[PDB]
Structures are given as structure tokens and as C-alpha cells.
Design a protein around this ligand. Structure first.
Ligand SMILES: [Ca+2]
Ligand SMILES: [Ca+2]
Ligand SMILES: [Ca+2]
Ligand SMILES: [Ca+2]
Lengths: 116, 114, 114, 116
């Protein structure tokens, strides 16, 4: 599992469940082509986005739908989404975990990168 | 102001100086239209991006060139940039976008005041 | 300044106003001696804690009463407070302790400038 | 496992390994009594600090030795430690994960609290 996403809610102190996540990859013509998407599970994790074969080198964007998340909770948040953009696999395959910590007017994101 | 950006560097414990910031406004076609840009000053701040008259309700993206910043310091970065996307909605409001940068992590916060 | 504290609220997107802050200096016995305190102002800032003459090298703790702050807003908190512990070491330096508060998370950063 | 601690390094994008963690509990006389301690593993996690029987209600302090961590890496950090203080189990037993994200001049900490 070369790409995983973990989302936490800093208001409730809990995993962020049913958060939509969309991954794009930058194409040769400099547009964003859809790559993979999914939703977080009860533990706030999203596995199985992609495979070692599909996850080639590239510039990737992970768009986490934080606005829908807050609105489902009856909250009016500031950000449209949390977008995380990075070059992947440039020095060979790595495993990437993208973590995001959500508040209504703030987010943080961290990358953990390991060598499989 | 109506819009300010503040950037801090969590590795050196200092304002992030000379960071490029570009602001885009979403156009009718779902594409991103340049709107304002500049470079943070010694205190890590960028004022004067826009004016009350120009800054209408809409969806804005603020893209902070964190990769160039870390390269300039000889520090190896993860992200291409940090992009902060939000809807501006109109009582009297001023927006400050604050960002805290590490090579493999960033946080951003909106401070919205009257 | 020599020592300033800045506090932001990530839930409401605003400066954290009227937050109690206590600063302690570590004494010879490994105990914490009160040193300075105050309440953040409208812009979420607390200036005037100490003076150049008073603020000597040593180990300091800044304890921000986040629990009282969230209670005052009717928001349920996790932490008792946020305590930021650091050694001050003397070229010319000013320290700003910045904190960003959520009910179950906080971040703190030191901004050390000349 | 009612109390777990996870530590990440935001400079390297990696788990923070061999980080000392000390837990204290506030005593009846208002002093901090030692409670449990340990070191993070390769994944940056510290399990087995305590048990359901030992982890009673109380005010707890988790002191993460972030200064030693940075110094071992040849880095001079700002903070002495990252200390996280909280009331536990007040409405019955919970499972607590205390996560910390480390930079040389900054840290963040988050609590994830679940109902076992
Ligand atoms: Ca390559
Ligand atoms: Ca409106
Ligand atoms: Ca010295
Ligand atoms: Ca009780």
C-alpha cells in the first residue's frame, strides 16, 4: 500500500470518518488527471487508493474534502478542502502516509515517507 | 488591508522571509485566475495584496511557494507548495492567512476579524 | 520587549482573547518559580511580561490556561493547559511564543529574532 | 492498551525512534508522582505504558523528551520537552492516543480518545 491517508478531528479528538479524498496526478500537458479516490473508514484511514504498479513517479495532489466533513457535522468551516501536493517516487518507490488534522478554521498536514 | 499572509519557519524558529505567495480567484469556468501576489518581508508578512474594492466574495486559493523557500536554505522539502483554499463571504471582515512550515509538514490557519 | 506570547483559536478563526498566561523560571531546587503573568489582549497578544534586565538565561515554562479559555466559550476541552518549556540563551534575541489552539490539539512555535 | 503515544519528525518525514516518554500522575498532595515511562519503537509508537487496572482517574502529564531526540541528531532545539497534561477517565475508562509532531522550534500534540 504505497499511499495511505489518515484524517483526525481536533475538535472532537477522534478519527474523521467518511471523509472523501481525491487524488490527482499532473499530466504531460500540465493538467490534473484523476488518479484515485476514496473515503476514510471508522479509524480515519483510507487504504487501497492505489497499487505499486499504478503509482508511478509524478506530481500528485491529494484533495481532502474537509468542507463536506464539517458541514455534515452542522459546522460552517473556512477551507474548501485540504490539498496536499508533492512529487512522488523520484528516487524510487516509497510508501507515503499523508496525515491531516482538521479544525474548522485550520488544518495541518504531515507526510511520513518510508522505504518499502 | 483585507487579506494578509503570515509565514513562520518551524525549523529555524523565525519568520519565513522572501517566500513567494500567489493568490488566485476561481473564475466561471472552474479555472484559477491570478488575483494577487508578492514575497514575504523580514517579519514574514505580506501586506497590500488586494483592496476592499477588488476582494469580492468568491473562492480563493493562496499558494505559498514552500519548495523554493526550503531550497534557498539548503533544507530538503516534501511539498511542492502549500495551497490554502477558502470562500470569502461578506459584516466587516479582514482575513489573515497564517502558515507554519516544516519540511514535511505545514499548518495553516485563517484569522478572520472585524 | 524580550518575551511575548501570541495565541490563536483554530475553531473560531480568531485571536484568543483573555487567555491567562503564567511564566515560571526554574529555580536551584528543580522547582518552578513564578516569573511573569498576564491575559492576552483583543489581538490575542500578551506584551510586557518581563524586561531585558529580568529575563536572564535559564529554563522557562509558559503555561497557557487553555481549559479556562474553552470553558468560557462553551466548548469542551481536552488539555488542562498548554505548557511550553525552553531554555533562554544569550547575541541580541527576542522571543515570541506562538500557540494555536484546538479543543483536542495545540501547537506552539518559538519565533526567535534579533 | 489505554494509553499510547506516537511521535513523528516533521523535518525528516519519519517516525521519531527512541524518544523517551515519561508519564506522571498528580498526587493527593498536588505533586507529580511517577506513573509510567518508555521509549518509542521503530514505528514511532510507545505501547504498554500501563494497564486498565493501573490507569485510574487522575490528572496525567506526558513528558516527551524532544530535546534529547534532537540532540542525538546533532540539532540544537528550542524546547526542553513536549509536556501534555490532561484529566483522564473522568466519565469512565477511555483509550487515549497522544500524538506529537516535532520540529526543532515547534511541536504540536493531539489527543485521540475512544470508548473501549
Ligand atoms: Ca526520477
Ligand atoms: Ca454570502
Ligand atoms: Ca549560554
Ligand atoms: Ca469521575
Amino acid at each position: 500500500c504505497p499511499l495511505m491517508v489518515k484524517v483526525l478531528d481536533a475538535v472532537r479528538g477522534s478519527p474523521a470518518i467518511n471523509v472523501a479524498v481525491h487524488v490527482f496526478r499532473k499530466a504531460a500537458d500540465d493538467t490534473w488527471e484523476p488518479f484515485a479516490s476514496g473515503k476514510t473508514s471508522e479509524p480515519g484511514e483510507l487504504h487501497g487508493l492505489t497499487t505499486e504498479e499504478e503509482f508511478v513517479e509524478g506530481i500528485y495532489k491529494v484533495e481532502i474534502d474537509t468542507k463536506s466533513y464539517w458541514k455534515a457535522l452542522g459546522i460552517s468551516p473556512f477551507h474548501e478542502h485540504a490539498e496536499v501536493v508533492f512529487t512522488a517516487n523520484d528516487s524510487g518507490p516509497r510508501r507515503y502516509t499523508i496525515a491531516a488534522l482538521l479544525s474548522p478554521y485550520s488544518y495541518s498536514t504531515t507526510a511520513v515517507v518510508t522505504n518499502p
